[model samples]
Target: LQRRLKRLYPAVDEQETPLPRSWSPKDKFSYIGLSQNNLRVHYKGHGKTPKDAASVRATHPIPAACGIYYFEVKIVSKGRDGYMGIGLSAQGVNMNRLPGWDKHSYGYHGDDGHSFCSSGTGQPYGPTFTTGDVIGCCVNLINNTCFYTKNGHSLGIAFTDLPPNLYPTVGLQTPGEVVDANFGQHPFVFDIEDYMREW
Candidate 1:
């Protein structure tokens, strides 16, 4: 994974800039980064707002099996936005929880359980993303372990075991979930498998 992570690769569109303040997800998304080849996409600006951060996920669906995997989000800081980071877990959008059949603890997102991030250790109080930074997280399900890195710091923590219902995706807000329906605004994409393979 280290070898694969070091090279300059084409990542999901960062949805540079943002829609007009009046704009909402209800509006169509303008994507950037893909050239004539269409094999990879690159994003530069979302009109002119100067994107703070964007969230995205795999174009394909993750299987319902369990195993270890690597996830990474490339964040570019332009404008006032100071940092960039990503998240992973058994759920998606809205700190969206895992289905009833698949249940676990540790970093589960909800009004209660606690939403962990890449900046710190277990259950809440994790890293708050600033601008111009890139983050990577590794989820080792079998061992129930989670690792986080920003710039070069490695923070480790143990999480409770759970079945796979949802794979990790990009997040922008502090804890990663939004109270309002339009919480997500940044434009980005997620590659479930190693980006090295995609390159």
Candidate 2:
């Protein structure tokens, strides 16, 4: 029986095995989610927002570069003004201590520069958090891979509750992009990578 089996499919493809990037990955890391209601955003294990609200920091974080990441957040409650956006910061920026903010709009705008995209809430939620509605953008942090939408909104991804393999980015952030003074409304999609080369 062993001899007959060997005559069939003799070997497996060793190249197919996914080896770790480095013998071991980083043991501590910090990441920020671009929106609210994300596991990392509401994570600290209670109804209250995460200590790192509007952001996420993983003690032992995963690492990947030139790959895609995704994060989905419910616009629980739009700010008093009614707008939301996603931004990427190489490192966390203290929104409160930012200059020219005067304590009001620091988190919305500052040294980070404008967000990749911003949108406004239209048929707004009824004062509580819900899953169906979200106002944000998908940005491609890569110097390349910049996909675009009809209204100039960029296409990319932010990390969230997805499996680790789905988000293997290192040294990246998905901070919330601020909405412009005018209504910034658009229908966002759940797609990260816009293209696939079939072999």
Best by TM-score: 1
**Regions more than 4 Å wrong, model 2:** 1-62, 97-132, 135-189, 193-199
Q: How accurate locally is residue 24 in candidate 1, as Cα lDDT from 0 to 100?
A: 24
- 1 Cα displacement, candidate 2 (Å): 31
- Model 1 TM-score? 0.41
Displacement of the residue 181 alpha carbon in candidate 2, Å? 24
Model 1, span 10-124: residue lDDT tens: 3322253121111122211132222222212223333223232233333322232224444433344322332222444343343222212123322322222234433233355
Q: How accurate locally, in lDDT, is each candidate? A: 0.33, 0.24
Q: How does each model score on TM-score?
A: 0.41, 0.32
lDDT of 2 by residue, 1-199 (tens): 3532122113322244221221112221232222222122311111122232332222212223323322233333333322222222222333211211111111122112222211211212122222234323222323222222222233322222222221211111123322211011111244333421110
Candidate number achieving the greatest lDDT relative to the actual structure: 1
TM-score of model 2 (CA atoms): 0.32
